[PDB]
Amino acid sequence: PSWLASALACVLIFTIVVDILGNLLVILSVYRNKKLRNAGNIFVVSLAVANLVVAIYPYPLVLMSIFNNGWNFGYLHCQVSAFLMGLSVIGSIWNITGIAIDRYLYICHSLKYDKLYSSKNSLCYVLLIWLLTLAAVLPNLRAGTLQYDPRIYSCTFAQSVSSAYTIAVVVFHFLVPMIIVIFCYLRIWILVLQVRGIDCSFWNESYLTGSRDERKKSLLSKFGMDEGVTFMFIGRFDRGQKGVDVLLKAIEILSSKKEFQEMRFIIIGKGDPELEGWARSLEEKHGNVKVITEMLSREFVRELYGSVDFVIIPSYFEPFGLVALEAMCLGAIPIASAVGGLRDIITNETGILVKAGDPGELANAILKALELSRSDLSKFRENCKKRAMSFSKLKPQDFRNFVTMFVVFVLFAICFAPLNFIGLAVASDPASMVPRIPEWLFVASYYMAYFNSCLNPIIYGLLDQNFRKEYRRIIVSLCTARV
Numbered sequence: 001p002s003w004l005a006s007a008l009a010c011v012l013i014f015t016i017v018v019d020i021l022g023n024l025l026v027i028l029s030v031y032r033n034k035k036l037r038n039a040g041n042i043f044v045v046s047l048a049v050a051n052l053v054v055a056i057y058p059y060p061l062v063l064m065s066i067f068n069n070g071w072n073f074g075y076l077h078c079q080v081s082a083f084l085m086g087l088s089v090i091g092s093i094w095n096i097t098g099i100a101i102d103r104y105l106y107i108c109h110s111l112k113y114d115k116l117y118s119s120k121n122s123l124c125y126v127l128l129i130w131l132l133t134l135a136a137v138l139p140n141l142r143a144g145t146l147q148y149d150p151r152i153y154s155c156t157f158a159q160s161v162s163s164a165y166t167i168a169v170v171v172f173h174f175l176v177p178m179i180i181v182i183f184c185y186l187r188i189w190i191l192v193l194q195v196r197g198i199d200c201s202f203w204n205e206s207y208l209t210g211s212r213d214e215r216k217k218s219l220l221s222k223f224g225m226d227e228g229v230t231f232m233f234i235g236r237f238d239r240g241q242k243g244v245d246v247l248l249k250a251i252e253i254l255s256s257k258k259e260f261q262e263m264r265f266i267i268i269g270k271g272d273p274e275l276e277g278w279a280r281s282l283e284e285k286h287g288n289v290k291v292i293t294e295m296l297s298r299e300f301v302r303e304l305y306g307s308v309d310f311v312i313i314p315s316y317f318e319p320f321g322l323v324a325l326e327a328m329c330l331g332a333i334p335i336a337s338a339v340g341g342l343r344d345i346i347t348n349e350t351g352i353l354v355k356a357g358d359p360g361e362l363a364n365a366i367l368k369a370l371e372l373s374r375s376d377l378s379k380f381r382e383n384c385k386k387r388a389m390s391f392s393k394l395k396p397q398d399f400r401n402f403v404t405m406f407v408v409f410v411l412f413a414i415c416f417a418p419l420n421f422i423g424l425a426v427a428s429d430p431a432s433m434v435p436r437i438p439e440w441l442f443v444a445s446y447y448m449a450y451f452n453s454c455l456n457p458i459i460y461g462l463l464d465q466n467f468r469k470e471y472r473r474i475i476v477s478l479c480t481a482r483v
């Protein structure tokens with residue numbers, strides 16, 4: 001239809017104008033604003049340079065080609081314009097990966113140190129990204145996989161020339177970065193929820209009265225057992241979640257060992273009546289095993305964390321693991337499954353890590369925990385506290401920039417997911433699938449991808465307070481005369 005042709009031209013005109021003005025504002029703002037002048041934003045400047053390239057030479061030729069309803073320029077213009085569109089779109093996905101790693105390394109640095117993370121080698125990594133993308137786009141000139149597509153009025157990467165090239169492009173320059181970025185932002189989100197989650201004004205040693213040795217002697221006395229190395233579990237009783245069954249099997253393995261006499265176990269929780277029986281059975285057979293099926297208050301749990309020597313976390317699946325942080329507040333050394341969430345909290349100096357679902361490896365860990373002398377235990381406890389303390393320090397920070405960068409990525413993925421999905425579909429049978437795929441779907445997936453080249457300036461102005469203020473600062477400074 002006549003309107004379908006002129007509609008596409010509007011989209012490109014809009015994309016071009018917004019891209020040039022908007023990305024000039026992004027590059028200006030970063031070098032103008034002191035807060036935006038960080039080296040971690042070098043990745044944002046190269047991304048704006050990548051976005052700008054397509055609007056000066058390739059996109060205006062595509063716009064002219066709509067009106068000509070054909071390629072009226074040379075084969076060389078068809079090759080160079082197709083090439084620079086490659087450099088831009090491949091450069092931008094890798095630059096987005098660069099930001100995703102930079103930000104994940106920034107949160108980790110602020111957790112371990114009081115000094116601000118300085119992305120010192122950031123400019124050196126941007127030079128590797130453009131060497132990586134130039135290495136990926138350049139083989140296409142000799143392969144002859146760049147040609148004109150009448151359906152979208154442009155010269156681009158033809159997905160039907162050779163399926164091997166298109167499969168590799170979809171795998172290495174879309175799926176691989178996707179997995180890396182999804183991993184970076186997932187690990188960031190969990191660490192923010194842990195920062196949010198902890199309460200240092202509740203889980204605080206100040207509320208505990210005497211000495212640790214005293215508190216423990218008193219706790220054990222109430223339970224009717226002598227002084228020993230005491231271990232505690234606090235969780236639901238279930239087959240494949242919190243792993244009280246791995247702990248129960250471990251207590252059985254240790255009951256034949258001489259070293260068991262020196263051990264004390266406080267198992268707290270409820271759930272499977274079978275796992276309740278097994279636990280009550282070990283309680284009757286051994287006077288160093290105590291089970292608490294009742295529900296205890298935060299206050300009493302806080303006293304237990306400040307008395308017991310170790311907290312066992314034998315979980316199969318533990319997304320956040322606030323329990324470990326809560327225990328570390330009151331100097332309880334955790335022995336926990338090296339699963340997600342707990343591996344982020346427990347460092348090698350602040351606890352013992354074990355492979356989930358192995359009663360043998362847990363039994364040996366408990367034996368290793370027993371062999372630790374008072375002196376080693378004091379440093380371990382001190383470390384545990386310095387680790388909990390580093391989580392709560394990040395509480396007043398502004399986590400808005402993480403959201404803006406995440407939105408910049410999410411929108412990139414939406415714009416390019418159809419193109420890459422079609423890419424795969426065409427790769428399966430280029431001869432058969434070129435007609436079998438709808439024309440509206442094809443034209444939409446290409447112009448959606450083109451539209452992405454103007455989105456980042458709009459996002460920065462809508463979610464980042466600094467970019468919003470600076471955009472206005474520049475606009476006025478150029479349009480308000482001096483007299």
Ligand SMILES: COc1ccc2[nH]c(-c3ccccc3)c(CCNC(C)=O)c2c1
Pocket residue numbers: 082083085086087089136137140156157159166169170419420423446449450
């Ligand atoms: C591999 O070398 C090149 C070379 C030139 C290229 N130009 C484009 C492209 C630019 C803007 C919008 C859509 C596609 C790609 C991306 C091509 N991806 C797919 C799935 O066909 C490209 C790749």
